[PDB]
């Protein structure tokens, strides 16, 4: 059903589903491995379903809508602990590429496309441990899709080839998020 910001595990799949206090964002878990948004002049929020704790070998399978109007993103999305890292594998945006500002670190070529890959340093930054500092990586996409797999160890072995250091896994989702837009999405993870 439609919830409101928070955590848990639906039809086994753990979600997350965050925003920023701002109106205009509807967030749903459906059936197995399904949730939904729909955003109207959000401002930021991501949320989504996948596996708490991920791990770093998943092959992640996606399907379904995605159709953002303006600044959003559909990636898998998640964190390891100790280092803290918060990491996306972006498959398709909006009107913003996310990585930019980020500092290229290569390219890796996985499920179908090559990837640019990025890093950059959060400050003080909200977290899943409370405000902290921490780098955030990035893999993106070259060929936009809404449906595919990922093998999560390319991406994870590309970024450690330029120093990344993967601690203890924490959750690991599909996730789609805005950024100050509207848009639609409807995706079952497996």
């Known amino acids: 059903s439609t919830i409101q910001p928070g955590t848990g595990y639906n039809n086994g799949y753990f979600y ?12 749903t878990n459906g059936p197995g491995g399904q949730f939904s948004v729909n955003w109207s002049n959000s401002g930021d929020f991501v949320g989504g379903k996948g596996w708490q704790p991920g791990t770093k070998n998943k092959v992640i399978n ?9 600044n959003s993103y559909l990636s898998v999305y998640g964190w390891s602990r100790n280092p803290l890292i918060e990491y996306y594998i972006v498959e398709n945006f909006g ?51 809404s449906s595919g797999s990922v093998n999560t160890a390319n991406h994870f072995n590309a970024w450690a080839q330029q120093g990344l250091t993967l601690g203890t896994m924490d959750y690991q989702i599909v996730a789609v998020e805005g950024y100050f837009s509207s848009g639609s999405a409807s995706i079952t993870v497996s």
């Open 16 to 27: 997350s589903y965050w925003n920023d206090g701002h109106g205009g964002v509807t967030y």
């Open 62 to 70: 996606f399907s379904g809508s995605y159709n953002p109007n303006g």
């Open 95 to 145: 009107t913003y590429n996310p990585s930019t500002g980020a500092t290229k670190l290569g390219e890796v070529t996985s499920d179908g496309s090559v990837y640019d890959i990025y890093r950059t340093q959060r400050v003080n930054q909200p977290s899943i441990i409370g405000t902290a500092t921490f780098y955030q990586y990035w893999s993106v996409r070259r060929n936009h899709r």
